Design an enzyme around this catalytic site. Structure first.
Site, PDB file in Angstrom:
ATOM      1  N   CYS A 147     104.632  87.024  31.711  1.00 26.49           N
ATOM      2  CA  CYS A 147     103.584  86.985  30.699  1.00 26.49           C
ATOM      3  C   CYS A 147     102.530  88.073  30.881  1.00 26.49           C
ATOM      4  O   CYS A 147     101.588  88.131  30.083  1.00 26.49           O
ATOM      5  CB  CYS A 147     102.913  85.609  30.687  1.00 26.49           C
ATOM      6  N   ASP A 170     100.996  80.253  36.686  1.00 25.53           N
ATOM      7  CA  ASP A 170     101.169  78.837  36.990  1.00 25.53           C
ATOM      8  C   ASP A 170     102.638  78.470  37.146  1.00 25.53           C
ATOM      9  O   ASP A 170     102.972  77.590  37.946  1.00 25.53           O
ATOM     10  CB  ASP A 170     100.525  77.979  35.902  1.00 25.53           C
ATOM     11  N   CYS A 207     100.228  85.910  28.000  1.00 22.79           N
ATOM     12  CA  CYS A 207     100.604  84.552  27.626  1.00 22.79           C
ATOM     13  C   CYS A 207     100.588  83.606  28.819  1.00 22.79           C
ATOM     14  O   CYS A 207     101.368  82.649  28.859  1.00 22.79           O
ATOM     15  CB  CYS A 207     101.966  84.533  26.915  1.00 22.79           C
ATOM     16  N   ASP A 208      99.727  83.865  29.800  1.00 22.72           N
ATOM     17  CA  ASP A 208      99.325  82.875  30.781  1.00 22.72           C
ATOM     18  C   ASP A 208      97.943  82.348  30.379  1.00 22.72           C
ATOM     19  O   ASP A 208      97.564  82.405  29.202  1.00 22.72           O
ATOM     20  CB  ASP A 208      99.374  83.479  32.191  1.00 22.72           C
ATOM     21  N   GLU A 239      96.885  71.729  38.432  1.00 25.04           N
ATOM     22  CA  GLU A 239      97.726  71.083  37.436  1.00 25.04           C
ATOM     23  C   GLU A 239      99.010  70.607  38.103  1.00 25.04           C
ATOM     24  O   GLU A 239      99.630  71.352  38.870  1.00 25.04           O
ATOM     25  CB  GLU A 239      98.042  72.045  36.290  1.00 25.04           C
ATOM     26  N   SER A 267     100.308  68.163  33.375  1.00 28.98           N
ATOM     27  CA  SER A 267     100.803  69.142  32.411  1.00 28.98           C
ATOM     28  C   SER A 267     101.477  68.476  31.215  1.00 28.98           C
ATOM     29  O   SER A 267     101.091  68.713  30.066  1.00 28.98           O
ATOM     30  CB  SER A 267     101.766  70.114  33.099  1.00 28.98           C
TER      31      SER A 267
HETATM   32  S1  FES Z   1     102.580  81.527  34.138  1.00 28.79           S
HETATM   33 FE1  FES Z   1     102.279  82.314  32.102  1.00 28.79          FE
HETATM   34  S2  FES Z   1     102.199  80.510  30.833  1.00 28.79           S
HETATM   35 FE2  FES Z   1     102.421  79.726  32.880  1.00 28.79          FE
END
Ligand code: FES
Ligand code: FES
Lengths: 551, 551
Positions: A61, A93, A134-135, A440, A466
């Site tokens: 991401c 994550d 997109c993290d 999380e 999550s």
């Molecule tokens: S590491 Fe990018 S959305 Fe979870």
């Protein structure tokens, strides 16, 4: 509220800040370095744009944000301005999920806000263009723009098109016996934190239209990057600043998009932190009010069938926001980073394509109210957050099964899954200070579902979960167990009752015995004594306050 | 001291940390992302190296670090390992000098330590290779390695070859009448903070030999970058960690290089912070002991004639360290990042070239003791730092001229320079908390020299001064004025006496009247209430403690 944090400009000039070092003769040393990096004498008169990317090679991401950063700098130069690229850190994550590395995830948002604020203030840049991935960094860049109150635009890196949850599910299905090892190797997107915040920030007006819906490496994403300089030049001419765009009404527009799209519960923490960065207030009750006013109309994962690229095909985020605006759910007079209001931006966007089955009508919503539910009661007196589909019933009651960490809960369900049947599982010590970092946790829900206990037990924590277990899953319980909240006084066998109708998590233990336990309770030692996580413990506020660290 | 900050490894393996996510089957989601960024099944068995650069386009000392980062990753792959590049932020003092942006300079060092610590911990990297620039980030990368205690190497970006102080001097000479405007436009390196710390860190053993002396864009600098992976692979095989290399003896080796080279007074703050990051202690008195034991032998700017490239020609830093080792001033048994000791590294390096006039002999030093002097007394009871050439005499006395900031001092010397003659100028409120950020101030000394008052007045502050006034210039005065130290109780007309022989800054005001002022003193309001600078105020320790923020 008067936010005093960053330097003030030294009126109709476009270089209100960079003129502090490019025009005075006492700043001859600053001009020599600017000449060293390639600025001409005519370049010293142009506005200077700070281009902040969150690029690193250890995540899908973020591995391609340097390409976007280069196109943003080209667009800034085509608009007749100077572009200075700098890059901050970020963590994945999906890589650290299930490990102690998750303790560093949420705090990186505030680290990123401090990073961009530091560079923009010392280098006296006039504007900012941030490119998060997109993290889950995104709110950090918005928090920095709110502190500085200089014109800025967030360019979402874009969501990766479908080929992580399927890869995380692979171990559970392998151990259960559904799939073999080979099927597991083969396996090794939707409305999660990345798509929730990007769509909410666009609805907030701080991203150009279609930014949250255009995929990551779509050719139009590069086109958006090369146009950010043009829009930012306009924002410098109008002096339209983040505190002009981030208002109580635009804050509600972002909350509306979260409820309508079934956004993640993490948006509660991030939108509260964003609101605080501009001197505004945003409480948990504000989220309940918007939730009870906006129906869930969005058949997207994880709750539904489709992903973000499907939104992109049926018209993208602006088509969705146009529908919500036509239903009177959003304030269209809010100024955006396009120099126009939200209604003027949406008036000329193609509507949702005819025959789309992603965005439900107001007649037939997935849920009449919002997914986000704020629960209080005896055990969460200061608040808690839960995602409710409306299909799990209103009540759950059972004896408490308390664990002082995610690790001891997973060892118990693995060794004795039947002792969890009918219990209210409590995983405490995972809050902002007791975690630390408020990690999380995805494994608790997956282990409960793999054991066949999805609808037969509840799940409470002072941290974050999550996914959903098709039952009652509650997080952000305040005060956290490290702070001596009631969640830290629960004993095994305590009857806990969750009432969604009353929005209460209550215990059968009398308030007098509860206070008897509180008088004997001593705070456990902090799990760290040095490093960034110890500074987080020294600085972070509660979950109901968005876990801000600069107050 | 037991430093608990970062995750522990899950013995002779080279991937002690990355195996937490690459080997367990419960981490299938972590392996899928690693497959997404381009790792094969065989790649999952190799060590993972975190490559942390401090690249940004707004400074000549960092604009080319992405090139070095790419060569480091290639060398890591040639050593059979996996390289993950990430980038942190950084600010330029030459750009922000003389502005409020300097309040963000020193804190960025601790921000960088938190940044690298965050990424290394969440991504479970096995080793680190940091590439800071010829600005003042360098100690931040070493502080992060000390917290993590994973094998790491610092690659100095290199000092720019000569064509900033000449450009900063241009305004003073222009206003005085020495040069015209055109001569000023034309103007628009030595042993400052960048070259001091790089040379000290190499003498500390955490950089490969010649790293601090090789110029920035020399072809050998790229060669060093492509070799860092080979040396780090060896450090993973030996498990030679930063807390094995950073010891009380190697800490003294760095202090010896600072005294011998006339290093900056900022090395006091940075070396104390580096020592704390590995659980060690380093006090101001330790600096006085090394100062009184190592003579100044280095004819380098700003004190001398030559620059760092001249060192590079006569044999570089290893040739200088070989000379100091032969004089018995350094401990040669200290392990380094080469897998060998300091003496084994220096035994086979070319000595100083015959006929060199840069490094003085022990017979004829520039100064018999070190430049760094630790002063205490009535006005700096907890310590202060000053750079003494030995040519300014031992004493200075005069009435106090107090200013609550750098701005009000510059307005006074501009309007009435003669009222400064014979005074002890006090610029207070510039400490870590009262500044905030403890800014470095170059203009006070330049304005004093341009007014012809170099040897006719003294200069005291709870912040930092950059250059010398050929007189008595003292900084780091503790406790700072914001904390209610004696520096905050001085009034105009107070007779202040600086005694270098006694190492005391004393006042003629009786200690009883001093305590009378203290009882009436109230702390001024903090200049900020939000942002990273307010978190700095909430976290930073005193100057005598290195301004650490994580304790
Ligand atoms: S590491 Fe990018 S959305 Fe979870
Ligand atoms: S900005 Fe690089 S040495 Fe000052």
């Amino acid at each position: 509220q008067s936010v005093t944090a960053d330097p003030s400009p030294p009126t109709n000039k476009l270089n209100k800040y960079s003129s502090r070092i490019t025009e005075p003769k006492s700043q001859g040393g600053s001009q020599a370095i600017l000449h060293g990096v390639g600025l001409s004498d005519d370049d010293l008169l142009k506005p200077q744009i700070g281009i902040s990317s969150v690029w690193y090679e250890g995540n899908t991401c973020n591995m391609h944000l340097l390409k976007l950063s280069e196109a943003v700098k080209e667009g800034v130069e085509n608009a007749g301005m100077v572009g200075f690229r700098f890059n901050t850190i970020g963590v994945s994550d999906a890589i650290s999920m299930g490990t102690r590395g998750m303790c560093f995830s949420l705090q990186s948002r505030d680290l990123i806000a401090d990073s961009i604020e530091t560079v923009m203030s010392a280098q006296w840049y006039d504007g900012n263009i941030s490119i998060p991935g997109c993290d889950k960094n995104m709110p950090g860049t918005i928090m920095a723009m709110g502190r500085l109150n200089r014109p800025g635009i967030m360019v979402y890196g874009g969501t990766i098109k479908p080929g992580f949850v399927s890869a995380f599910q692979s171990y559970g299905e392998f151990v259960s016996g559904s799939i073999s090892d080979e099927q597991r190797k083969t396996v090794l997107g939707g409305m999660y934190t990345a798509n929730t915040m990007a769509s909410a920030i666009e609805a907030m007006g701080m991203s150009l239209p279609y930014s949250s819906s255009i995929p990551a490496e779509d050719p139009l994403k590069l086109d958006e990057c090369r146009l950010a300089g043009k829009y930012l030049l306009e924002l410098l001419k109008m002096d339209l600043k983040p505190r002009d765009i981030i208002t109580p009404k635009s804050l509600r527009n972002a909350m509306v998009s979260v409820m309508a799209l079934g956004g993640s519960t993490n948006a509660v923490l991030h939108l509260i932190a964003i609101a605080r960065s501009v001197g505004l207030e945003l409480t948990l009750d504000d989220f309940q009010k918007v939730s009870d006013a906006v129906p869930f109309l969005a058949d997207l994962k994880p709750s539904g069938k489709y992903v973000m690229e499907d939104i992109h095909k049926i018209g993208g985020t602006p088509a969705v926001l146009r529908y919500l605006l036509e239903l009177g759910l959003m304030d269209g007079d809010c100024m955006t980073v396009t120099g126009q209001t939200l209604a003027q931006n949406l008036e000329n966007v193609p509507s949702l394509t005819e025959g789309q089955e992603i965005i439900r009508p107001l007649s037939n919503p997935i849920k009449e109210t919002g997914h986000i539910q704020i629960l209080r009661g005896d055990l969460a007196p200061d608040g808690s957050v839960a995602k409710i589909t409306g299909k799990e019933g209103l009540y759950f009651s059972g004896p408490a099964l308390v664990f002082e960490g995610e690790e001891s809960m997973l060892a118990a369900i693995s060794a004795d899954p039947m002792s969890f049947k009918g219990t209210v599982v409590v995983i405490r010590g995972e809050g902002p200070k007791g975690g630390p970092g408020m990690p999380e946790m995805l494994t608790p829900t997956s282990a409960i579902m793999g054991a066949g206990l999805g609808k037969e037990c509840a799940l409470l924590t002072d941290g974050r979960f999550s996914g959903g277990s098709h039952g009652f899953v509650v997080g952000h319980i305040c005060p956290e167990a490290q702070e001596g909240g009631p969640i830290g006084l629960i004993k095994n066998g305590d009857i806990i009752t969750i009432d969604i109708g009353a929005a209460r998590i209550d215990t059968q233990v009398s308030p007098e015995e509860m206070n008897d336990r509180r008088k004997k309770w001593t705070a456990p030692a902090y799990k760290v004594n040095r490093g960034v996580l110890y500074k987080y413990i020294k600085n972070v506020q509660s979950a109901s306050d968005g876990c801000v660290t600069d107050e």
